[PDB]
Amino acid sequence: PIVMVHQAISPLTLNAWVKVVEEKAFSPEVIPMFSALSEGATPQDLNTMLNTVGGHQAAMQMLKETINEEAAEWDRLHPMREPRGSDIAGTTSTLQEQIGWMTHNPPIPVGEIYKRWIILGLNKIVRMYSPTSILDIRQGPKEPFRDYVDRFYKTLRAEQASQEVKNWMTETLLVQNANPDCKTILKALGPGATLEEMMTACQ
Amino acid sequence: PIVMVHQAISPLTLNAWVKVVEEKAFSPEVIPMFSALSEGATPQDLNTMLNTVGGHQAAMQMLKETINEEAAEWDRLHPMREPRGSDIAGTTSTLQEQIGWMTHNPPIPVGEIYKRWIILGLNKIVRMYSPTSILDIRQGPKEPFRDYVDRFYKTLRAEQASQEVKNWMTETLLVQNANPDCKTILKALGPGATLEEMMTACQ
Amino acid sequence: PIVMVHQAISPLTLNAWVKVVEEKAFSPEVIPMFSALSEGATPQDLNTMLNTVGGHQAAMQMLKETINEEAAEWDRLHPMREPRGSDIAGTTSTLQEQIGWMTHNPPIPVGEIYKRWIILGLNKIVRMYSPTSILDIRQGPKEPFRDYVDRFYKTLRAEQASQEVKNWMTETLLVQNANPDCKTILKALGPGATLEEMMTACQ
Amino acid sequence: PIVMVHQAISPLTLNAWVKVVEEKAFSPEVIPMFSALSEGATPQDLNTMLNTVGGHQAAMQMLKETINEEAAEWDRLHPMREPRGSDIAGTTSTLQEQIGWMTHNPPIPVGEIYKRWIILGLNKIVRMYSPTSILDIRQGPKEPFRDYVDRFYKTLRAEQASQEVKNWMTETLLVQNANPDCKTILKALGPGATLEEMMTACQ
Amino acid sequence: PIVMVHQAISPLTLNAWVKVVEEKAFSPEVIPMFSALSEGATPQDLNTMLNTVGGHQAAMQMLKETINEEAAEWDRLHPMREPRGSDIAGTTSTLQEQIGWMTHNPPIPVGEIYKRWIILGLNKIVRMYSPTSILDIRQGPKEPFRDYVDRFYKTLRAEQASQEVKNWMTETLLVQNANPDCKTILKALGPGATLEEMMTACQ
């Protein structure tokens, strides 16, 4: 990272990243992990981080394709030297040039732009690995209400609905997709009931 | 943490937190762990920590609801700019504003207030996820006395009884709810016998 | 720890401690782990460390009983303010007072005395959880000699025999309690044979 | 490492390296791990790192043989003292001489030369441990398309084909070697279809 | 360690050591790890490190016996104060004295001598726990050639043969002890074939 002088990336960050990816794959919570681990990262460090993933090479090739396409679109829209597309990807620029950019006046936040492209690609990948849609989640005859609610809320988070859409899904789908007994309990609770009241009544 | 200058959050804290939650769920001892891991944390850091949990998304939504309700009640009671409820929760304030606040004279301890709200929500959730009451724990015909005592004391800790109530429960319930052989042994020991003496006599 | 200024306790120490207790219970080697992890700890830190154990709440109550009894005996024998019994246990003293005491001239090593009380309680508890005595360990008809010797020496360490007693036990008991074939081999080796020679002859 | 003064190598790097090798063997992503962990390493540190691997002793001896061959060829092409072949391997030079070299003006990048030889040997070994060729990868009757594609791309990365060859393999082989249903779907998609479109159509 | 002032040993080193011993027992690669973790260690630190091992108490008693034997022989051969035998083992000297010796002029590297004795004892124990000799490794009818070669070379590394003897063993024994198909392949390859060529031909 940069903190102003350059500091070597620690092995701990690499090990944490590889372990999170091995254990959690592309579950939605991996993205805030990337965001925390990439604080202050240069493009070289980010490329190192990307290369450190051992599995899922299809996803990583997709990521390379998306980042290079976004860099080409940047070069089409936005023609010490000025950084070009191949400069943002860290493949034709040296560390010293990146350090110079990070400490120039005014600063050119090339790291933040690369991180934004990377988070866009990860969002695409997480969207791709979405197991099932929200409408396909229905409570089993003996499925625990808490476990079913947790799975439903996880699926809703996995989707890309807007806040108004997410709120409407939370309201309508949860009551509509519940098992008949829990649906009757919620209906007896009445509209406007908070999540805690419904959960404590169902149990 | 803050130590005064800002320091980057370490990967170790995130990994420890995720591992404790995966391995222990909401057992009571997770809260002092949270308290230790959040030493000097800004609210942004707390939101990062919260978002990194991958499962139990019902619980995390419950926590968000409780924190936002407490921030609204604070704003109702307590109407550099002055922080509003959503400012205390770190959703509309930047890191730089938080660093400025942490080093202001007099300091405005937004981190301690946010931590208090979070610990209130965790206490509520642990109390809600309490498996069974104290009165339902009875010793089996061949259950080991040490294991039964450990389970009883764990259940008592899980409850929210006051110190006088907890002491009365420890005295009356333990002797009354024990299996007949251990109850007879304790009665033969006599009143005022310490816990260590009773345990070493039962074994 | 204190190193002189106060430094926040690291998550690594908490995670190591909880894991050692989970993996090793009260095997004798857990005590040197406590001694290493509690270097420079304040009483607040010790209470934090104790509270982080999730299981074995019987053991922790026994520890609380022993520490409070020893603090009462200390107050009976030993009636900036002077610390009382409840001050060493960190329940009625603040962090700032502990820092002041730790950096006074002359220093009052309240942490080392508290550590001594804690180690006394751990020695008492480990002795209590001793599975079996030394005399009940006899080699099986087909039990490997190395595994049996390792188990025997572990049991001997678990006991509280003096150095002269331990040495006599190592000499007499090992040869006497061994299976007949290994006993004959050791007798053929002759007195004064070192442990390595006996082990390499038996194998 | 050197950062300029010498710093002791941390235990974390050694533990990370041994664990990565234990868990991933010589999968291709292990090479970027070596590259990140060996930042600033002296030859002594690199020899320690290599020797700490416990299994796969055939591969590590092969690496020693290969490195000594490059050192002999270097001595053939390139006959404060000057470093000789056995000096590049760190077997006949002291710490003081290597530190002196690392800080000479002009610098003699003995670490970079040793690292290049090591990465060449690891690349040779990974090529040797290549399980199967690309042409032997065929989709099963019920094999998931995503898993098959991931395995195919992993195998392709494991190979040493040039960029033009790799691109032609990705285009022709993937469509030709797929199962009939996915092949028909891809043909219906038409030429020029991106990886994301093909993957989202197949699923 | 000493780096010159004394620094407290970190919990990370202890945890790494206990984990390596738990996971690898006395496999040969544990020794260079010990050597790296004990950089700059005083004898007090070495005794602490040793005591943190929870299992394998037979081996540790053997190690104590061996170290005391070298200290007695040293005292027989080698009769600010001068360090005696019991002083090198850290049982009768204080920390202040050890720091004083480590910084004396000329320095007396009593720590290096203790480390040499410790590595001698570990080498003796690893040799003793050597499972089988080199001559007993024969390829199975369907055993993979790579796995068999790795196991054979690991066994060879476990031995203490000289370089000329080890090299002759690697050449003659590997080809002679191989399964008939691989032996025929190697014979068809001809003398002077390198290990990589033979391995890539066999596969």
mmCIF file of N, CA, C and O in Angstrom, chain B residues 51-130:
data_model
loop_
_atom_site.group_PDB
_atom_site.id
_atom_site.type_symbol
_atom_site.label_atom_id
_atom_site.label_comp_id
_atom_site.label_asym_id
_atom_site.label_seq_id
_atom_site.Cartn_x
_atom_site.Cartn_y
_atom_site.Cartn_z
ATOM 1 N N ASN B 51 -20.619 -6.174 7.732
ATOM 2 C CA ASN B 51 -20.948 -6.653 6.393
ATOM 3 C C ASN B 51 -20.169 -7.904 6.005
ATOM 4 O O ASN B 51 -20.610 -8.643 5.119
ATOM 5 N N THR B 52 -19.030 -8.159 6.649
ATOM 6 C CA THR B 52 -18.184 -9.293 6.298
ATOM 7 C C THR B 52 -18.753 -10.642 6.748
ATOM 8 O O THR B 52 -18.302 -11.681 6.252
ATOM 9 N N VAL B 53 -19.766 -10.659 7.613
ATOM 10 C CA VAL B 53 -20.409 -11.916 7.984
ATOM 11 C C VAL B 53 -21.233 -12.427 6.808
ATOM 12 O O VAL B 53 -22.022 -11.684 6.207
ATOM 13 N N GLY B 54 -21.020 -13.686 6.441
ATOM 14 C CA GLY B 54 -21.670 -14.228 5.264
ATOM 15 C C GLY B 54 -22.999 -14.912 5.507
ATOM 16 O O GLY B 54 -23.896 -14.820 4.664
ATOM 17 N N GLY B 55 -23.157 -15.597 6.637
ATOM 18 C CA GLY B 55 -24.405 -16.254 6.958
ATOM 19 C C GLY B 55 -25.294 -15.382 7.823
ATOM 20 O O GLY B 55 -25.062 -14.183 8.001
ATOM 21 N N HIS B 56 -26.325 -16.016 8.387
ATOM 22 C CA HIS B 56 -27.159 -15.409 9.428
ATOM 23 C C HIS B 56 -27.642 -14.011 9.040
ATOM 24 O O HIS B 56 -27.672 -13.093 9.861
ATOM 25 N N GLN B 57 -28.023 -13.845 7.769
ATOM 26 C CA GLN B 57 -28.347 -12.513 7.266
ATOM 27 C C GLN B 57 -29.614 -11.963 7.904
ATOM 28 O O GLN B 57 -29.791 -10.740 7.966
ATOM 29 N N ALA B 58 -30.479 -12.847 8.406
ATOM 30 C CA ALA B 58 -31.624 -12.417 9.197
ATOM 31 C C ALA B 58 -31.149 -11.644 10.418
ATOM 32 O O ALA B 58 -31.660 -10.563 10.727
ATOM 33 N N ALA B 59 -30.192 -12.220 11.145
ATOM 34 C CA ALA B 59 -29.624 -11.572 12.319
ATOM 35 C C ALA B 59 -29.022 -10.216 11.975
ATOM 36 O O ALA B 59 -29.184 -9.248 12.725
ATOM 37 N N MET B 60 -28.305 -10.126 10.854
ATOM 38 C CA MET B 60 -27.662 -8.866 10.499
ATOM 39 C C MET B 60 -28.684 -7.808 10.105
ATOM 40 O O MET B 60 -28.502 -6.621 10.411
ATOM 41 N N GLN B 61 -29.784 -8.223 9.477
ATOM 42 C CA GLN B 61 -30.861 -7.283 9.182
ATOM 43 C C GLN B 61 -31.536 -6.833 10.469
ATOM 44 O O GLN B 61 -31.899 -5.659 10.612
ATOM 45 N N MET B 62 -31.735 -7.766 11.402
ATOM 46 C CA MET B 62 -32.255 -7.428 12.722
ATOM 47 C C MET B 62 -31.382 -6.385 13.409
ATOM 48 O O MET B 62 -31.888 -5.414 13.990
ATOM 49 N N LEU B 63 -30.064 -6.563 13.317
ATOM 50 C CA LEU B 63 -29.118 -5.615 13.897
ATOM 51 C C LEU B 63 -29.209 -4.245 13.242
ATOM 52 O O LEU B 63 -29.191 -3.217 13.930
ATOM 53 N N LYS B 64 -29.282 -4.213 11.907
ATOM 54 C CA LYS B 64 -29.454 -2.946 11.201
ATOM 55 C C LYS B 64 -30.737 -2.239 11.620
ATOM 56 O O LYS B 64 -30.744 -1.020 11.835
ATOM 57 N N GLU B 65 -31.832 -2.990 11.741
ATOM 58 C CA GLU B 65 -33.090 -2.396 12.179
ATOM 59 C C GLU B 65 -32.947 -1.777 13.564
ATOM 60 O O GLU B 65 -33.358 -0.632 13.792
ATOM 61 N N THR B 66 -32.351 -2.521 14.499
ATOM 62 C CA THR B 66 -32.208 -2.011 15.861
ATOM 63 C C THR B 66 -31.315 -0.775 15.918
ATOM 64 O O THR B 66 -31.644 0.204 16.600
ATOM 65 N N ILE B 67 -30.176 -0.801 15.219
ATOM 66 C CA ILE B 67 -29.280 0.357 15.237
ATOM 67 C C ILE B 67 -29.958 1.581 14.629
ATOM 68 O O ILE B 67 -29.831 2.695 15.154
ATOM 69 N N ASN B 68 -30.673 1.411 13.509
ATOM 70 C CA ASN B 68 -31.326 2.573 12.912
ATOM 71 C C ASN B 68 -32.459 3.095 13.788
ATOM 72 O O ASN B 68 -32.667 4.315 13.866
ATOM 73 N N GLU B 69 -33.157 2.205 14.500
ATOM 74 C CA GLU B 69 -34.193 2.666 15.419
ATOM 75 C C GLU B 69 -33.588 3.446 16.577
ATOM 76 O O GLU B 69 -34.131 4.478 16.995
ATOM 77 N N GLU B 70 -32.453 2.976 17.100
ATOM 78 C CA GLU B 70 -31.801 3.699 18.186
ATOM 79 C C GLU B 70 -31.256 5.040 17.712
ATOM 80 O O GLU B 70 -31.292 6.024 18.457
ATOM 81 N N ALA B 71 -30.754 5.104 16.476
ATOM 82 C CA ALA B 71 -30.295 6.386 15.949
ATOM 83 C C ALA B 71 -31.455 7.359 15.775
ATOM 84 O O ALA B 71 -31.317 8.557 16.053
ATOM 85 N N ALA B 72 -32.620 6.856 15.360
ATOM 86 C CA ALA B 72 -33.783 7.729 15.238
ATOM 87 C C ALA B 72 -34.256 8.221 16.601
ATOM 88 O O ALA B 72 -34.626 9.392 16.752
ATOM 89 N N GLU B 73 -34.235 7.349 17.611
ATOM 90 C CA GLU B 73 -34.618 7.779 18.954
ATOM 91 C C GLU B 73 -33.620 8.778 19.531
ATOM 92 O O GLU B 73 -34.012 9.730 20.219
ATOM 93 N N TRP B 74 -32.329 8.587 19.250
ATOM 94 C CA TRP B 74 -31.322 9.566 19.642
ATOM 95 C C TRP B 74 -31.610 10.916 18.994
ATOM 96 O O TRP B 74 -31.536 11.962 19.649
ATOM 97 N N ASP B 75 -31.927 10.910 17.695
ATOM 98 C CA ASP B 75 -32.238 12.160 17.004
ATOM 99 C C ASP B 75 -33.484 12.807 17.587
ATOM 100 O O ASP B 75 -33.590 14.038 17.620
ATOM 101 N N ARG B 76 -34.434 11.992 18.047
ATOM 102 C CA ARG B 76 -35.629 12.538 18.678
ATOM 103 C C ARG B 76 -35.283 13.183 20.012
ATOM 104 O O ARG B 76 -35.859 14.214 20.378
ATOM 105 N N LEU B 77 -34.345 12.592 20.752
ATOM 106 C CA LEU B 77 -33.967 13.126 22.053
ATOM 107 C C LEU B 77 -32.847 14.156 21.972
ATOM 108 O O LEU B 77 -32.732 14.994 22.876
ATOM 109 N N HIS B 78 -32.023 14.121 20.925
ATOM 110 C CA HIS B 78 -30.863 15.006 20.798
ATOM 111 C C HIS B 78 -30.841 15.553 19.376
ATOM 112 O O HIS B 78 -30.016 15.150 18.546
ATOM 113 N N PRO B 79 -31.774 16.461 19.042
ATOM 114 C CA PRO B 79 -31.800 17.071 17.706
ATOM 115 C C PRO B 79 -30.537 17.873 17.401
ATOM 116 O O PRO B 79 -30.641 18.962 16.833
ATOM 117 N N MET B 80 -16.903 21.997 12.206
ATOM 118 C CA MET B 80 -17.497 20.691 12.457
ATOM 119 C C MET B 80 -19.009 20.798 12.631
ATOM 120 O O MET B 80 -19.497 21.561 13.463
ATOM 121 N N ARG B 81 -19.744 20.024 11.837
ATOM 122 C CA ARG B 81 -21.193 19.983 11.935
ATOM 123 C C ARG B 81 -21.622 19.029 13.044
ATOM 124 O O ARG B 81 -20.869 18.151 13.474
ATOM 125 N N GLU B 82 -22.845 19.218 13.517
ATOM 126 C CA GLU B 82 -23.300 18.300 14.547
ATOM 127 C C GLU B 82 -23.775 17.007 13.886
ATOM 128 O O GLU B 82 -24.428 17.047 12.842
ATOM 129 N N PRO B 83 -23.462 15.852 14.471
ATOM 130 C CA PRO B 83 -23.847 14.581 13.843
ATOM 131 C C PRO B 83 -25.306 14.244 14.107
ATOM 132 O O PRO B 83 -25.805 14.407 15.223
ATOM 133 N N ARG B 84 -26.001 13.814 13.056
ATOM 134 C CA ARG B 84 -27.347 13.288 13.189
ATOM 135 C C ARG B 84 -27.277 11.765 13.295
ATOM 136 O O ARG B 84 -26.198 11.167 13.272
ATOM 137 N N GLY B 85 -28.442 11.130 13.444
ATOM 138 C CA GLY B 85 -28.479 9.678 13.571
ATOM 139 C C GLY B 85 -27.765 8.955 12.448
ATOM 140 O O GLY B 85 -26.925 8.084 12.686
ATOM 141 N N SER B 86 -28.089 9.306 11.201
ATOM 142 C CA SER B 86 -27.452 8.651 10.067
ATOM 143 C C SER B 86 -25.974 8.998 9.966
ATOM 144 O O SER B 86 -25.221 8.279 9.300
ATOM 145 N N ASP B 87 -25.547 10.084 10.613
ATOM 146 C CA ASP B 87 -24.127 10.409 10.675
ATOM 147 C C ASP B 87 -23.409 9.484 11.645
ATOM 148 O O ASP B 87 -22.277 9.058 11.390
ATOM 149 N N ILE B 88 -24.055 9.169 12.771
ATOM 150 C CA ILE B 88 -23.462 8.277 13.758
ATOM 151 C C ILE B 88 -23.293 6.882 13.171
ATOM 152 O O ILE B 88 -22.337 6.169 13.503
ATOM 153 N N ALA B 89 -24.196 6.478 12.281
ATOM 154 C CA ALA B 89 -24.148 5.165 11.651
ATOM 155 C C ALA B 89 -23.201 5.097 10.460
ATOM 156 O O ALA B 89 -23.071 4.023 9.861
ATOM 157 N N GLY B 90 -22.539 6.195 10.098
ATOM 158 C CA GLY B 90 -21.496 6.108 9.095
ATOM 159 C C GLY B 90 -21.967 5.921 7.671
ATOM 160 O O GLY B 90 -21.157 5.564 6.812
ATOM 161 N N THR B 91 -23.248 6.154 7.385
ATOM 162 C CA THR B 91 -23.779 5.948 6.044
ATOM 163 C C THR B 91 -23.772 7.209 5.192
ATOM 164 O O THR B 91 -23.813 7.106 3.961
ATOM 165 N N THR B 92 -23.722 8.391 5.811
ATOM 166 C CA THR B 92 -23.700 9.650 5.074
ATOM 167 C C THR B 92 -22.521 10.529 5.469
ATOM 168 O O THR B 92 -22.464 11.691 5.052
ATOM 169 N N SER B 93 -21.584 10.010 6.258
ATOM 170 C CA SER B 93 -20.393 10.745 6.648
ATOM 171 C C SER B 93 -19.167 10.048 6.078
ATOM 172 O O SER B 93 -19.144 8.822 5.924
ATOM 173 N N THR B 94 -18.148 10.838 5.761
ATOM 174 C CA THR B 94 -16.906 10.301 5.227
ATOM 175 C C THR B 94 -15.929 9.936 6.343
ATOM 176 O O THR B 94 -16.100 10.299 7.508
ATOM 177 N N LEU B 95 -14.892 9.188 5.958
ATOM 178 C CA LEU B 95 -13.833 8.827 6.896
ATOM 179 C C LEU B 95 -13.142 10.070 7.446
ATOM 180 O O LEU B 95 -12.829 10.134 8.639
ATOM 181 N N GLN B 96 -12.853 11.046 6.580
ATOM 182 C CA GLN B 96 -12.147 12.250 7.009
ATOM 183 C C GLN B 96 -12.919 12.999 8.090
ATOM 184 O O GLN B 96 -12.329 13.515 9.046
ATOM 185 N N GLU B 97 -14.240 13.074 7.958
ATOM 186 C CA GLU B 97 -15.037 13.715 8.997
ATOM 187 C C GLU B 97 -14.919 12.958 10.313
ATOM 188 O O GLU B 97 -14.819 13.565 11.387
ATOM 189 N N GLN B 98 -14.936 11.626 10.245
ATOM 190 C CA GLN B 98 -14.797 10.808 11.443
ATOM 191 C C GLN B 98 -13.435 10.995 12.110
ATOM 192 O O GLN B 98 -13.353 11.086 13.341
ATOM 193 N N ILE B 99 -12.353 11.041 11.323
ATOM 194 C CA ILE B 99 -11.029 11.296 11.896
ATOM 195 C C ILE B 99 -10.993 12.673 12.550
ATOM 196 O O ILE B 99 -10.426 12.843 13.637
ATOM 197 N N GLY B 100 -11.579 13.677 11.894
ATOM 198 C CA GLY B 100 -11.633 15.006 12.484
ATOM 199 C C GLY B 100 -12.362 15.003 13.813
ATOM 200 O O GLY B 100 -11.911 15.609 14.789
ATOM 201 N N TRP B 101 -13.505 14.321 13.863
ATOM 202 C CA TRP B 101 -14.279 14.210 15.097
ATOM 203 C C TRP B 101 -13.475 13.514 16.193
ATOM 204 O O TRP B 101 -13.474 13.955 17.348
ATOM 205 N N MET B 102 -12.792 12.417 15.852
ATOM 206 C CA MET B 102 -12.060 11.650 16.857
ATOM 207 C C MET B 102 -10.947 12.462 17.503
ATOM 208 O O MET B 102 -10.527 12.136 18.620
ATOM 209 N N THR B 103 -10.459 13.503 16.834
ATOM 210 C CA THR B 103 -9.358 14.306 17.345
ATOM 211 C C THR B 103 -9.802 15.719 17.696
ATOM 212 O O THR B 103 -8.956 16.588 17.926
ATOM 213 N N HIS B 104 -11.110 15.966 17.744
ATOM 214 C CA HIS B 104 -11.619 17.276 18.110
ATOM 215 C C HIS B 104 -11.436 17.516 19.607
ATOM 216 O O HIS B 104 -11.214 16.590 20.391
ATOM 217 N N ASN B 105 -11.530 18.784 19.999
ATOM 218 C CA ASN B 105 -11.444 19.189 21.401
ATOM 219 C C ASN B 105 -12.663 20.031 21.758
ATOM 220 O O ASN B 105 -12.742 21.207 21.359
ATOM 221 N N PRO B 106 -13.634 19.481 22.501
ATOM 222 C CA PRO B 106 -13.688 18.148 23.125
ATOM 223 C C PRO B 106 -14.025 17.024 22.148
ATOM 224 O O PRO B 106 -14.721 17.241 21.159
ATOM 225 N N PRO B 107 -13.535 15.812 22.405
ATOM 226 C CA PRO B 107 -13.845 14.687 21.514
ATOM 227 C C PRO B 107 -15.320 14.314 21.581
ATOM 228 O O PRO B 107 -15.944 14.358 22.644
ATOM 229 N N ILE B 108 -15.874 13.943 20.430
ATOM 230 C CA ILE B 108 -17.240 13.427 20.353
ATOM 231 C C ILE B 108 -17.178 11.929 20.055
ATOM 232 O O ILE B 108 -16.953 11.517 18.909
ATOM 233 N N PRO B 109 -17.354 11.080 21.068
ATOM 234 C CA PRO B 109 -17.080 9.626 20.961
ATOM 235 C C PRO B 109 -18.135 8.842 20.187
ATOM 236 O O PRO B 109 -18.864 8.002 20.727
ATOM 237 N N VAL B 110 -18.239 9.126 18.883
ATOM 238 C CA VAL B 110 -19.254 8.468 18.063
ATOM 239 C C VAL B 110 -19.003 6.968 18.003
ATOM 240 O O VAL B 110 -19.948 6.171 17.913
ATOM 241 N N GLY B 111 -17.739 6.553 18.093
ATOM 242 C CA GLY B 111 -17.443 5.131 18.096
ATOM 243 C C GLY B 111 -17.987 4.426 19.323
ATOM 244 O O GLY B 111 -18.536 3.327 19.219
ATOM 245 N N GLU B 112 -17.857 5.048 20.498
ATOM 246 C CA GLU B 112 -18.378 4.424 21.710
ATOM 247 C C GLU B 112 -19.900 4.339 21.683
ATOM 248 O O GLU B 112 -20.479 3.345 22.131
ATOM 249 N N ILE B 113 -20.565 5.363 21.145
ATOM 250 C CA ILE B 113 -22.022 5.340 21.052
ATOM 251 C C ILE B 113 -22.483 4.257 20.084
ATOM 252 O O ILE B 113 -23.423 3.497 20.367
ATOM 253 N N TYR B 114 -21.828 4.167 18.923
ATOM 254 C CA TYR B 114 -22.165 3.121 17.966
ATOM 255 C C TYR B 114 -21.918 1.744 18.567
ATOM 256 O O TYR B 114 -22.723 0.824 18.384
ATOM 257 N N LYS B 115 -20.811 1.589 19.297
ATOM 258 C CA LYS B 115 -20.511 0.326 19.963
ATOM 259 C C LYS B 115 -21.575 -0.021 20.992
ATOM 260 O O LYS B 115 -21.929 -1.192 21.157
ATOM 261 N N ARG B 116 -22.065 0.980 21.728
ATOM 262 C CA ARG B 116 -23.135 0.732 22.688
ATOM 263 C C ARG B 116 -24.397 0.244 21.989
ATOM 264 O O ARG B 116 -25.047 -0.704 22.451
ATOM 265 N N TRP B 117 -24.764 0.875 20.874
ATOM 266 C CA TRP B 117 -25.918 0.387 20.122
ATOM 267 C C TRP B 117 -25.703 -1.044 19.639
ATOM 268 O O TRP B 117 -26.609 -1.885 19.721
ATOM 269 N N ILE B 118 -24.502 -1.341 19.138
ATOM 270 C CA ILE B 118 -24.225 -2.682 18.630
ATOM 271 C C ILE B 118 -24.286 -3.712 19.751
ATOM 272 O O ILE B 118 -24.859 -4.793 19.581
ATOM 273 N N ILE B 119 -23.723 -3.392 20.918
ATOM 274 C CA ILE B 119 -23.753 -4.348 22.019
ATOM 275 C C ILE B 119 -25.173 -4.531 22.533
ATOM 276 O O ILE B 119 -25.550 -5.634 22.943
ATOM 277 N N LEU B 120 -25.989 -3.475 22.510
ATOM 278 C CA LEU B 120 -27.401 -3.632 22.844
ATOM 279 C C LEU B 120 -28.079 -4.605 21.884
ATOM 280 O O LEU B 120 -28.827 -5.496 22.308
ATOM 281 N N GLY B 121 -27.828 -4.454 20.580
ATOM 282 C CA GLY B 121 -28.444 -5.363 19.626
ATOM 283 C C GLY B 121 -27.971 -6.799 19.780
ATOM 284 O O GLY B 121 -28.770 -7.736 19.684
ATOM 285 N N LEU B 122 -26.670 -6.996 20.014
ATOM 286 C CA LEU B 122 -26.165 -8.349 20.256
ATOM 287 C C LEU B 122 -26.745 -8.955 21.528
ATOM 288 O O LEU B 122 -27.034 -10.154 21.569
ATOM 289 N N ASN B 123 -26.876 -8.162 22.592
ATOM 290 C CA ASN B 123 -27.507 -8.684 23.799
ATOM 291 C C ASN B 123 -28.951 -9.091 23.536
ATOM 292 O O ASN B 123 -29.395 -10.160 23.973
ATOM 293 N N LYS B 124 -29.691 -8.266 22.791
ATOM 294 C CA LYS B 124 -31.054 -8.638 22.421
ATOM 295 C C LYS B 124 -31.092 -9.933 21.616
ATOM 296 O O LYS B 124 -31.933 -10.804 21.869
ATOM 297 N N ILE B 125 -30.188 -10.086 20.649
ATOM 298 C CA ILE B 125 -30.224 -11.276 19.802
ATOM 299 C C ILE B 125 -29.831 -12.528 20.585
ATOM 300 O O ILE B 125 -30.487 -13.571 20.474
ATOM 301 N N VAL B 126 -28.746 -12.458 21.368
ATOM 302 C CA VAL B 126 -28.364 -13.603 22.191
ATOM 303 C C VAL B 126 -29.497 -13.986 23.134
ATOM 304 O O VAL B 126 -29.780 -15.175 23.326
ATOM 305 N N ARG B 127 -30.157 -12.998 23.750
ATOM 306 C CA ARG B 127 -31.288 -13.323 24.610
ATOM 307 C C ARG B 127 -32.398 -14.000 23.815
ATOM 308 O O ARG B 127 -33.033 -14.943 24.300
ATOM 309 N N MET B 128 -32.652 -13.519 22.594
ATOM 310 C CA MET B 128 -33.701 -14.099 21.759
ATOM 311 C C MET B 128 -33.348 -15.536 21.377
ATOM 312 O O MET B 128 -34.205 -16.427 21.424
ATOM 313 N N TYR B 129 -32.087 -15.783 20.995
ATOM 314 C CA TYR B 129 -31.610 -17.112 20.610
ATOM 315 C C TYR B 129 -31.307 -18.004 21.807
ATOM 316 O O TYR B 129 -30.650 -19.035 21.634
ATOM 317 N N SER B 130 -31.754 -17.634 22.999
ATOM 318 C CA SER B 130 -31.612 -18.494 24.164
ATOM 319 C C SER B 130 -32.371 -19.796 23.930
ATOM 320 O O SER B 130 -33.602 -19.765 23.769
#
